[PDB]
Structure 1
Amino acid sequence: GYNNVLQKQEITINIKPINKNFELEDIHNSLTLKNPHIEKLEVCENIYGINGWLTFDLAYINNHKDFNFLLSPNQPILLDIQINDSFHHKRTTRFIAIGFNSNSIDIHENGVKKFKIQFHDPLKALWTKHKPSYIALNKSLDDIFKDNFFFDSLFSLDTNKSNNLKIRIPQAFISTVNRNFYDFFIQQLEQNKCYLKYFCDKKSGKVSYHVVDQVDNDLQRNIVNSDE
């Protein structure tokens, strides 16, 4: 502590499992955190994405509510982080992210267990482990990106404002040879010189990306910060 005029700082974490068919389940139906069991969390923001780490503590061995989340690789995990601070007046920040990775679980003991989970914004952490390579004909780009996008019980992406990606192309060569499809989402987006916008709704959490070829009032009609 030893600060002024910070009154309170309460931070929460909401954790759900994500099934085979990319919908949600219930384990308060989740593993909420508290008066912090958290040693350390790291978050960086961008216009496009979120990264970082998360460490926390639990107890003990064993309980069936803790088995399915943190004892297996390759199960996707929502991480709803809310930060709420009061001073006077209150201000809130909120994060939504998915973290799963193959071939990596970090757990420590010495009945207190440690854990280490990473962060990506949900379009990245899903399309990383997804490598198609095929040919399309007579299809524009926004026709392509929604053919690979199978996520509507999680979030949505808003491509209705660009009017450059919807130009038709007769020969398409989608190629992920040694690389990631999420790179292909960004590389050809660079050669059309567009914007990405990660955006959370604090009330309530519904992530929706935005791709606008300029910067206008219409985006600024949708970063209206729900504060006073």
Structure 2
Amino acid sequence: INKTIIKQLNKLRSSLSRGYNNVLQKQEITINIKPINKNFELEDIHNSLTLKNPHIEKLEVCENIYGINGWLTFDLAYINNHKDFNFLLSPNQPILLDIQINDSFHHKRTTRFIAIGFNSNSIDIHENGVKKFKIQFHDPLKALWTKHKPSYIALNKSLDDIFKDNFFFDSLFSLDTNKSNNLKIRIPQAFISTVNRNFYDFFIQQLEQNKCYLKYFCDKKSGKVSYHVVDQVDNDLQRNIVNSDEDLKDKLSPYDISCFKKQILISNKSNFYVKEKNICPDVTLNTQRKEDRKISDTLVKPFSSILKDNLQSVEYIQSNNDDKQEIITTGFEILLTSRNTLPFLDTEITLSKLDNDQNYLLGATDIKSLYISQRKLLFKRSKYCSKQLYENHDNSITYKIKDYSNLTPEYPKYKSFSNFYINGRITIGENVNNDSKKAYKFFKNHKPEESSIAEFQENGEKGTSAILNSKADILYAIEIAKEMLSDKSSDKPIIYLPLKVNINSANN
């Protein structure tokens, strides 16, 4: 020559108890484990824990473009030895995890992982001479910066100097900030505040608003984690993200038919958006107040008589403009469950293209080249190999596909920070006189320069002696409690700040 073929995958998946998988010649999974010391370097015990023909029950690996999260369950035996003592009987010990995978089919395909797990207040070991273990996964820059919460003030520092002066990890990996140059623009004042949140979540948030990219990457030969922060996707990424294996074909070969399970959609391009009319309720702005927001895209119809208003907080400050955003529409998402790592296709998350020659997907007839944006790896040790190795593996892989034309960065959930309070003086000069003991002086342009209350005073105000909207760009000088800086403070802490005139006042 359809239940003869439809039930055939069931007894195939029932024979996954003991693994009966075509066309895998051999699949082994390796885990190295190292300790990480007091000062973030490496030690020895093959001089480690290393893994083989598995003790492992079940490991779970997902990938974003930036992160790796999941679980690990393996076995050891038995009590008692120093090789197993000091690692997993103490929390907060950082642990490198080096995972390599070969897949022999007439060729081999590799995937390699470097991840850090450590944790407070939770270690998990189950028993009944046989011991279980559990370990969570994080990519290295996350898990180290997760348990790190400082808050201080910086002056005249570009952003990449802030990250390179909080990063103390050189026997582990590096981060490469030499291509962005949005982050190398110097800001006159800087307010780090990990009040109730994570510095890693601070690290994403200001990286979010500049609208940059992150990429996680490992050398397969040999392991070096190296991030990248790029404003675009260029040739200078793809000089580095060429996959270091071969038989690297594209275009969805007809050997994929033997390896799928489910071909699942999430949303697609619509033709119906909701209007989003901006509103800035502001007496004394002599323009339109209602204007529309702007879509990135066209050929999409609006609805009728349904609005999404977008107000703004109107404080005493001279009201600025305009936080130019878009109206974020949908994309094109395909989940693909398959039983093996696919033959003849590049299942490595590059920021490249993958052509669409055919229509065996749900897909769309219009859409050209695509790319990959996730993985999942539920691995299960087979039931048979969990008997003799208990007396003396399965695979399931998904993928996230998006449109290459709809390429955008991806960011995880985090916390927007919370405010906090600071008390401070006002001074003007330093060697201040005595008949000039208590005067007042206003400063121009983030510099100690005598400004005026003139000169700003927009065209309804030239002039009586009356300020409307209590204008910004007039600065005070404020001494701080000095201990909110770095220890390398070759500075005098003076934060310039704008003015509420209406503190010691009336309107009179």
| TM-score after normalising by structure 1 | 0.99
Return the alpha-carbon distance in structure 2 between the equivalents of residues 200 and 34 of structure 1.
Answer: 21
Q: Which structure would you say has the larger Rg?
A: 2
Q: Residue deviations 1:36-81, cap 9 Å, x none?
A: 1000000000100100000000000111110111111010000000
The alignment-based identity, stated in percent, is 100
Return the alpha-carbon distance in structure 1 between the equivalents of residues 60 and 199 of structure 2.
Answer: 26
Task: Quote the offset at 1:209 in angstroms.
Answer: 0.3
Return the alpha-carbon distance in structure 2 between the equivalents of residues 5 and 85 of structure 1.
Answer: 10
List 4+ stretches of structure 1 deviating above 4 A: none
Q: Residue deviations 1:162-200, cap 9 Å, x none?
A: 010000001000000000000000000001000000000
Return the alpha-carbon distance in structure 2 between the equivalents of residues 4 and 61 of structure 1.
Answer: 39
Q: Residue deviations 1:94-116, cap 9 Å, x none?
A: 00000000000000111111000
- Structure 2 residue aligned with 1:98, among 100, 106, 116? 116
Return the alpha-carbon distance in structure 1 between the equivalents of residues 78 and 92 of structure 2.
Answer: 23
Return the alpha-carbon distance in structure 2 between the equivalents of residues 74 and 5 of structure 1.
Answer: 42
Task: Quote the offset at 1:88 in angstroms.
Answer: 1.1
Return the alpha-carbon distance in structure 1 between the equivalents of residues 20 and 84 of structure 2.
Answer: 36
Task: Quote the offset at 1:3 in angstroms.
Answer: 1.6
Unmatched runs of 5 consecutive residues or more in structure 1: none
Return the alpha-carbon distance in structure 2 between the equivalents of residues 189 and 29 of structure 1.
Answer: 39
Task: Quote the offset at 1:34 in angstroms.
Answer: 1.1
Q: Residue deviations 1:93-138, cap 9 Å, x none?
A: 0000000000000001111110000000000000000000000000
Task: Quote the offset at 1:5 in angstroms.
Answer: 1.4
1:211 alignment counterpart: 229
SS state at 1:65 partner = helix
Task: Quote the offset at 1:151 in angstroms.
Answer: 0.5
Is residue 106 of structure 2 the alignment partner of residue 80 of structure 1? no
- Structure 1 residue aligned with 2:195, among 153, 177, 180? 177
1:16 alignment counterpart: 34
SS state at 2:102 partner = strand
SS state at 2:44 partner = coil
Is residue 183 of structure 2 the alignment partner of residue 186 of structure 1? no
Return the alpha-carbon distance in structure 1 between the equivalents of residues 182 and 65 of structure 2.
Answer: 20
SS state at 1:196 partner = strand
Which structure carries more relative contact order (alpha carbon 8 Å, separation 6+)? 1
| TM-score after normalising by structure 2 | 0.45
SS state at 2:205 partner = helix
SS state at 2:135 partner = strand
Task: Quote the offset at 1:4 in angstroms.
Answer: 1.5
Unmatched runs of 5 consecutive residues or more in structure 2: 1-18, 247-508
Is residue 216 of structure 2 the alignment partner of residue 202 of structure 1? no
CA RMSD between the two structures: 0.5
Return the alpha-carbon distance in structure 2 between the equivalents of residues 96 and 191 of structure 1.
Answer: 28
Task: Quote the offset at 1:86 in angstroms.
Answer: 0.3
Return the alpha-carbon distance in structure 2 between the equivalents of residues 105 and 8 of structure 1.
Answer: 33
SS state at 2:157 partner = coil
Task: Quote the offset at 1:84 in angstroms.
Answer: 0.5
1:32 alignment counterpart: 50
